Every structure is written in C-alpha cells, then in structure tokens.
Write a protein that binds this ligand. Sequence first.
Ligand SMILES: Nc1ncnc2c1ncn2[C@@H]1O[C@H](COP(=O)(O)OP(=O)(O)OP(=O)(O)O)[C@@H](O)[C@H]1O
Lengths: 538, 723
Amino acid sequence: KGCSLTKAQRDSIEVCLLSICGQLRPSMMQHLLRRLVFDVPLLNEHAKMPLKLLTNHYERCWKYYCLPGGWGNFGAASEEELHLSRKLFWGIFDALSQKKYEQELFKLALPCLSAVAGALPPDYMESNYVSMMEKQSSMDSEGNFNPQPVDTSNITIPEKLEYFINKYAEHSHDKWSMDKLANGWIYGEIYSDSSKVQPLMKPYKLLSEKEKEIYRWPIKESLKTMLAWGWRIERTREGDSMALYNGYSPRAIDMSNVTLSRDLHAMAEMMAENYHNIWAKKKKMELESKGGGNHPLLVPYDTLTAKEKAKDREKAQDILKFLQINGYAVSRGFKDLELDTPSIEKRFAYSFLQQLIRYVDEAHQYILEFDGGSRGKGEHFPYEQEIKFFAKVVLPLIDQYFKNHRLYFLSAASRPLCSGGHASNKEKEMVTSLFCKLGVLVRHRISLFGNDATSIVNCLHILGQTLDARTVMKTGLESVKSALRAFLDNAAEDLEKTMENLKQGQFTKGVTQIINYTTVALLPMLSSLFEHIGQHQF
Amino acid sequence: PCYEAVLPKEKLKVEHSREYKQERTYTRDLLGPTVSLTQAAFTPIPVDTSQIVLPPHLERIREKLAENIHELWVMNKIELGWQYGPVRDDNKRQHPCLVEFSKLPEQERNYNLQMSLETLKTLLALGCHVGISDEHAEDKVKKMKLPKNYQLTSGYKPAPMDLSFIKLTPSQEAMVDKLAENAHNVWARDRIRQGWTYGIQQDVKNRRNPRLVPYTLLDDRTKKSNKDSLREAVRTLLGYGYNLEAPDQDHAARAEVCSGTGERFRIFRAEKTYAVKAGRWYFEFETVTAGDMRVGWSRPGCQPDQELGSDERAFAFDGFKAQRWHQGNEHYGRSWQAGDVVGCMVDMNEHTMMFTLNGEILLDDSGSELAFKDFDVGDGFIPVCSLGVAQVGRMNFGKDVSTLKYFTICGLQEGYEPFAVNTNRDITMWLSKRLPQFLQVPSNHEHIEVTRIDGTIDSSPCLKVTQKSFGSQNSNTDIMFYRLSMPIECAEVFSKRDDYDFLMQTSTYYYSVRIFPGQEPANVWVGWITSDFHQYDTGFDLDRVRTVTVTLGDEKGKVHESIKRSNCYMVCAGESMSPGQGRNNNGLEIGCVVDAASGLLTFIANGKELSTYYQVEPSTKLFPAVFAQATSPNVFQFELGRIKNVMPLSAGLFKSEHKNPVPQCPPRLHVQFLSHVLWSRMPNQFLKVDVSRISERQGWLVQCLDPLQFMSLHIPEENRSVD
Ligand SMILES: Nc1ncnc2c1ncn2[C@@H]1O[C@H](COP(=O)(O)OP(=O)(O)OP(=O)(O)O)[C@@H](O)[C@H]1O
C-alpha cells in the first residue's frame, strides 16, 4: 500500500505475497482478509493486487468453504469467515456496479467476484449475531493505528469484587515480596537503593494504604471493562470457604500449570487487544506531546509479534485464573435471543438471486428503452455502461455460479449429495422464472449485442440443460408458470414464422436480424431444451 | 416364569452366550460390534406440554371442537352397536355417557375436553403450527344429516361437513401418527403410575398388563383404535378450516452411535508367522451385509485399535465410499451390495496389489488397474479385514480350491495361488481383543511418561507420571487407569524410632500417592484394585464399581455372616480434601495402609484417618492403583515410604525382602496402564454342543459329550492365565 514504490518493486511485492498466501494454510490469512474486506471495496489502482490474491485464495480453498466438513485436515469454516466473505462479495458486487466500465479492471475483477460466489455456499444463513468493537477505525488509512479506548467508567463493582481485589491485593503484595526476595532486598531501618533495604518490611495489617490503589485502580478499570461488554459475574461457595478458613515472606501457588479453556483463551486475548490499545493510546498521546521519535511498536496488535505480546498475555492469563481461584464465574456478554432459520431469505442464494432479479428487471426496462431509442440512428444512452457491466460480469457470473453449484440447485435434499444441497421448491421456481425472463430479454436482440450475444447464448443454453422443470410444473407460483408458458409460446410462434420465411425464401432489416437470431441461437437452444427434457423425462 | 418375558412376535431360542461356535472356517460368520440393545426396556417418553400456551383462536375453537368430536366418537361406537343405559356395565349394551355432554358425567366430559387440549397443545409442541385458512370457513356451518335411529339418544347431529372433501398430506399424516404414538405413550405413563407392567394376558389377580408395548410393536386392533381416533380428530380439525402448517422436516444422521462400549470396529487377521515375503497369493472375502467394512493386506505390526489404512501398517479397500486406505483416503472402485465377493490379490515380487468385486477387476480413478502402485517388502504381508457395527463377513483363505468361486474366472489364469494353497492344518486366525488388560507403559507412548526417582537418604523411592503431550492440540483428555505390577497377598486364614519388635512381627504395609499441584484432585482416585478389574469407561465414579454381597445364612434363615466383594477399593482425593482450595499450597498426600492379617483397608490423608474403610476376604491379591484425569503436565507420583510402625510396600511385595524395614523399589516393580492394543487368538477347535426342543413337556435340551482341553500358562505375579 505504500506509494513511493517503483513499478518493479510493486511487482516483486505482488508476486511474493501471491506465492506466500497461495502456499499458506487457509486459516492463517483470515487476519489479512479482515483488512482486505475493508480495503478492496474502494477498488482503486491499489486494489488490483488484493483482487488477484482473493481470486487465488478462493480458487484454492473453495472446497473448504463449500463442503460443511471441508478438507478433513484443514478443518471447516468458522462462520465469521463466512460473514466477512459475504460482506466482501456484496461490497465488490455493488461497488463494481456503481462504478464506470474500465475494460481491464472489469476483466480482472470478474474472476475474483465469480470465485467468491462459487466459494460461498448458496444456502448460507446470515449470521444474526454481530461483532464487538469492529476495529476498522483502528486500522485507519491515515496513521495506520487508531487505538480507540472503550469507555468503561460507567459501571461500578460490588462488595464481592471489593473482597476480590482485597484478596488479590494481598496476593499481588505477595508477589511484590517474592520479587523482593528473588532480587535481594533485605530488612533494615534506613532507606538505601544500593543497600537493598526497602522501608516496607512491616506487615500487611499495617501495610500502607496507597500501595493497593496502584493495584486496585488498574485492576478496577480492568474488571469494569470486562463488565462493560456484558459479563454478569457471580460467586460460589469457595470464597465462603476461604473466609471461614481465614513486608513478609510469602509463598506462591503455582498457577501457569493449570491450563485454560479455548473460549476463555480467546476471551483473554481479545480483552488483551482492548487494553493494549488503551496502552497504545496513551503512548501515542505521549508521541504527539513529544512531536517526534515515532515509536516502532505503535503498529496494530494483529501485526505485533508474540514475544512482545506476552507482556500482556501473562496478566490476562493470571488475572482470569485468580478470578476463578477466588471462585467467580465467567459469562458471555450476550446470548442469542432467536435464530431465524425458517426464513428462506436467510440463505445466501436467495438474497443473491433476488438481487439478480432486480438487476435483470432493470436490464429489461433498459432494453425496452433501447428498443424505443433504436428507432433513432444514434443509440447514445447512459445505460451502455450498465449493459456492459451486466453482459460482462453478471451473466458470466451467473454462468460461473451455476457451473459451480449445479448439484445444489438440482438437489432438493432428495438423495444425491447425502450431505445436503437442498434448493427449495419456491427458490427453484423463481430460478426458472429468471431463466425464462432472461430468455425473453435476449430474444431477437443479437445485433444490438456487441458480439456478447455469443456468451449470452452460451449461458442461455447451459441454463437450458440445467433446469428443474419437473419441480416447477409440479409446484410453483402459477404467475411464474404463466410467464414461462408465455415465453415458450412466443418461441413457439417464432419457430413457425421461421419455418415460413425460410420456406418461402430458401435463403436468408428486422426480419433478417430475427431470422439470423433463429439460425444461430434457437437451434442450439432447441437442442439444449429437447435434450434436457428427454434426459430428465420432463 | 421366564417364558413370558419374550417379546411378542420374537421367538425364544437357546443360543451361545458368545458370538462364535464350532463350524467350518470358510463358513464362519465374523461379527463386528453389536448395536446397543436399548430397545429392550420400553420406557415411555411423552413430551411435556405444560409450557405450551394455546393460541386464542384455539381456546375459542376447541370447546365446540371437543363437543363435536365426542358426539362423533359416540357415533363411532353406535356404529359398533353401543347403546345408552342407566347402568355403567359395558357388557349389557348400556352406558350412561352416550348422552349429551351435559347429561354425561362432567368429569369424563372434562377429561375429554382436556385430552383434546392435550392433542392441540402437543401438535403445537411438535412444531405443527396451525393457521386458519379463512374465517368464513368457520362462519359457514355445513353439517351432514343424521337420522334419529342411527343417531344417539340426544338430538345433536354429530356428522360434520362431508369429510371426503379434505385430504391430509403425507408429512402431516406422519406427524399426526406419531402424535397418536405420543398419546399411547401418555396412556403408558398413566399405567406405570398405576403400577401396571407388561405381560402376556389380563391378570387383575397378578395386576400386570399384556398390552404395554412400543407402538412399532403394538397390537393390530388397538393400532386401528388409535387410527380411528386419529382419523376422526384430524378430519374434524381440518373440516373446521383450522389448517395446520407442517414444521420444517430436516434429515438427521445418527450413524450407529448405539454400540457395545466405544468399540467402532473389530479387526480380523491371520497369525504373524503366516506372512508372505515373496510370490503371488489370492484370498476371498464375502460380504454378508453391506456396511463400513475394509479388507486388504496388513503388516505384522498392525495395531488392533487403529482403523485400517490410517497408518502405514495396512492396505485396505472400503466399499460404501469406494475408498482405498493407506496413509490416507483416496477414491477407488465402487460400492458392494450384500453377498458380493471382493477377494484380494498381491504380487510380492513386483510389489503390486489388485482387487476385484464379483469377478470384475476394480479400476482406479484413472485407467490404471493397480490399486497400490509400489511398496517395499518390509517384514511381510498378512490378510486382514475390518468389520463395523452390526456387520457380518466371511473370509476364505482357499484351503479348498473349489470353494473359491470367482478365483477360476479371475485369479487362476493369471497364476495367483490361494493363500492356504498347500497347508494340511487349518489357519490360526487372530482378532482384536475386546476386554482391556494392564500392560507396561511404552517408552514411545507420547501421551504417558513415567520417571523413576531413586530414593535418597532423606527421600523415599518414587515413581512419577507425566504427560508429554499435555497442552498441545489433537490431545484428547480421557481418564487413564494406572496400577503397580506386583500385588499384595492377604493372609490365608484371618486371625480372630519405631518399635523394632512390633515392626518385625507386623504385617501392615503402606504406600502413598502425591498429587502434584495444578492437577485438581477431584479427578484423581487412589486405592487398591484386584486382577478382576477390566472396566474401561470415559467417565468413572465410585458408585458404579462392580460389587456383590454374598450372605451365608443358617438353617432357619438368619444371616450369620455377610461378605462384601468388589474388584475396586478406592477413594477420591477431592472429597478427601477437608479445606477447599487448601491443597493448592502443597500437593496432597493420600496414604494407604493394608493389614494382611485382618484385611482392613484404611486410608490416611494429610495425617488424618479418613472415615472410608474396606474389609476384604482372606487371600486376596490387591494391586496398588491410581486413576486420574489430567489437568496439568504433572499428574501424580507414587511414593514407597513408610509411616510410623508400618512396613514399606517392598516387604509385602518381595519375599526376599520380607524383614527389611528399608523401603526399596526393585526394577521388577513398574507402572502399568489399562490399554486396548492387544490381540486374541481364536481357538482352532470349539466344543461340540447341540441344542434342540424335545417337546413342550420336555423343554429345550443341551448336550455336550466329547472333551476338549488346552494347556494354560499362568503368570504368577499378574494372577493371569493364557493359552
Ligand atoms: N375418560 C373417559 N371418558 C369417556 N369414555 C371413556 C373414558 N375412559 C374410557 N372410556 C370409555 O371406555 C372405553 C375403554 O377405554 P380405555 O382405553 O381407557 O380402556 P381400559 O380397559 O381402561 O384400557 P386401556 O386404557 O389400557 O386401553 C373407551 O373406548 C370409551 O368408550
């Protein structure tokens, strides 16, 4: 993303990153994907390399995202990868839609978008749950780090936590004293740093009252930033047992040896980025106070290296471990109220295909306006960019999506693909409506097509032999049935009039254009329809 | 009597307790793990519906719904000839509930109303949502006429609008049928609450029921009873227009979780000495049932616990997925149906293997017929197969060439020889052992590590258990069972600075176990076990230990003595802790003392004598043992020290050190752990036993008349015996 790079330097970086990311584990790059989902939709000259890298990733690891199990060794999706991939796909799709047509940019973007579409499962439920403190503000384009501190001074702690930090204050003073012992300080009456004599050999019952507050207040802010995210923390009988049992040499209960659960390891590391970002906030403020000497460690925590990050993992781990040592409980900030799985709209393919419905109906209205303006000599319309986008991406993307997901649309959870792949009946019938409506759009319009009619016919006939006609005439919306029957009947009289004109004239202007459309498209189209009908017994 | 415990259509037979019997080796039916027989106990499980709240349109539909439907059921009974009368007796064709709901007992009327409520609420609880198609449907009142004579005494005409108009879709029909299943389950709940269990016939004297049986096994006539009530209820409910919308029906796969213990498969193979090192060989495998079976060639080092093809030991072929198996899974061949033969071929000299299926040679994804291209000779190859849950298979080693049927069409002309081409004696075949045994912890074992700590002048000799793979991924946490190799022998006849004389004449022995800090002790159990202990469970508790109480009584019946027998005598450290979290200061020290003269097993923890104590029979071999679940890299440690006035465990264990107060840990003593990686040898010849029904008067006859013998090798220290 740096700008001063030369062309050769840029190319070297591109090829290096391409090779590395291509040969890396699929799970590793989701961290970078989290920045790619935010940087790609700008689609500047810089986003080209992200487009290649996304293409290669999804072409490599489509089977991982497509199969619920994926590769057995690689694992399976985490569904936040699915959410970010959905957002990436929709952002590229819509942004490319509203930007103007550049031939090279569009040819390069097509494989990427059409590969994300193939990788994403069609039936993908939208995750009704959302994230916390999305850090796209932190990974700001200018400054490269905005260490925003989450506000926490609104919540207060109860008397249970009062006793908790009291006992942890004894406990932290205990490590104070054992660090003292391991360092070499000794008991005396005078204060000298070299002599290794601290003025604090007097016990806890007399211990100074300022000295916990430097443990209390930071840890207080720590527990309140826990409780700000939604923790409802309670206590068990272990603390009651402690109370019942009821400058000095302590002993430390070994404490790293106990291993922690997966979700709370993630919990500690996320609270760790929150508190490391607060630390980097004060450090950055100190940096503008100085006005120079940029601190090298001001880089995002996702970009920090592990050795220096141990500096806050040790406190995260030990503070949580002593949290259930003093017998409290951990709670997730929120639990989902309801999952809206009945919604067929919750499927990825549903929202996607209705977006196709709106875009193709837009194309229908345009081609109507282009037919009304085709009686004018110059078809200089503002919608040429829209039709170029359509016939160059969306219809080729339709081709890609269906030739990636043949089985899902053809399977209705009948018996093929015992893993699943159910395309619902109404989803199927509206897909058939899209097919017939595309056919209506493309009929007798080859000449206006800038040689794109070839690709149009390719997508048309592959859709012709990839249908669910049996399902549609056993179940469907009868208005959709009427539309498809009207399309097939319009084609029916087209065949008759093309018998006529070709028999009165053995050799082949609107009638010339439409008979050319016939002789070059309907014969493959009729072959595809009849062969599909005769192979699936429709 | 035991004859009436048989399931109704099931037929009583007397069969072998174990799977296998005496028959020809090629006709032998190898059996995989059986499915767990959880269906033996018929426990009704009606779904609770108290949480279900009825929609307002259903409260203000179901009163007249209920009244119409009981008027219809009294129509359904007057169809059979059922008449009203003052007397309650059903036999005399008279019954005072045939009258209108007001006149009939309001208690039975209310039971009918709330069972209609239960039906609707249970439809709601099954996800069977209900949506009225149109309110005009219940605005309009269509009601078929009924003559007075065909009708009841009341003038009400129960016949609703003509029911032939409405039809119920198959999925709705299915859910409603299993709703009726839930209804009969509620009836069974009531019967069990009454005290009324399954039998063969109506015995008010014995007070059992015959008809208590699962619905899939339910009797026909009552089957049609619930069918007719079902028909009536759903037909009326649809007639009132209250259309019910089916909940989504998604496929679910259980894939045979029900099985005996955790065994997923059983591995069958020949003897290691029969390994082939050169030449070409052929054998056959007949699949009686289609299933998750694997057949092929394995190396002598194949582990009975791991699945075939996962490691480098074995080469196998899978049917259903059509997958070759060696160091991974790749696509090959097709799936087999029941009765298919899949016999294998191997060419050792050019190092190739091929497969067939009913004669035709299976091909790769490519055109290559070669199942596995090239491989090293190694130490040899030996036939092997894997049988899954509820799977039956047969192996033919070609002792008789005529029994190999597809060999002639394919395999013979190429030159392959039968595996048992030239053998006068039958092949000894080895299978995976089902019952785990205690064996020495391997050094290569990556999960369990044992350190021997020499005892200094101030420290007792110690054995400490460590997990090397703790904290790493792919590591599965499961309870491990550990014991000490040498047992303590109790006295044969029970008698009914320390003191040197007392320590010399005493027979009490002591060992202690330290649970290292970080290993929470509720997962740690300490005590003694006997040689009979062979139970492997992922979840172990002191309640489920096997025990029996033999009571020997005098002539009139008084129990003059009673004995407790159990293989496990163990205590938990979690309960042993008196102070909660008071153990994290230093590792807790369980101590066990055994008095061989009196057979008293008492435990001392942290200097206090725990209340739990055991009494064992004379001459009982007790193995020191510790069961623990790992929560830390360091789990626990054995300590062989001696407490005041007690003889260390070395004196009890070793005879040559009987009178040596100094604790010792000789190299013979070692820590063993329970494991499943062991083979078993199937006997070449079995006992000939014939069983048959002589008559009803004479019963089933069992007869064994010819003797067989085997010489058993007995390991003294382990109290074991093997052929
Ligand atoms: N609560 C009730 N309200 C109205 N009629 C009832 C009621 N219970 C039983 N009857 C009548 O008695 C008949 C017998 O019903 P029921 O099935 O309860 O009989 P049972 O001999 O107790 O046997 P079981 O319940 O085990 O099948 C019913 O068909 C019905 O005519």
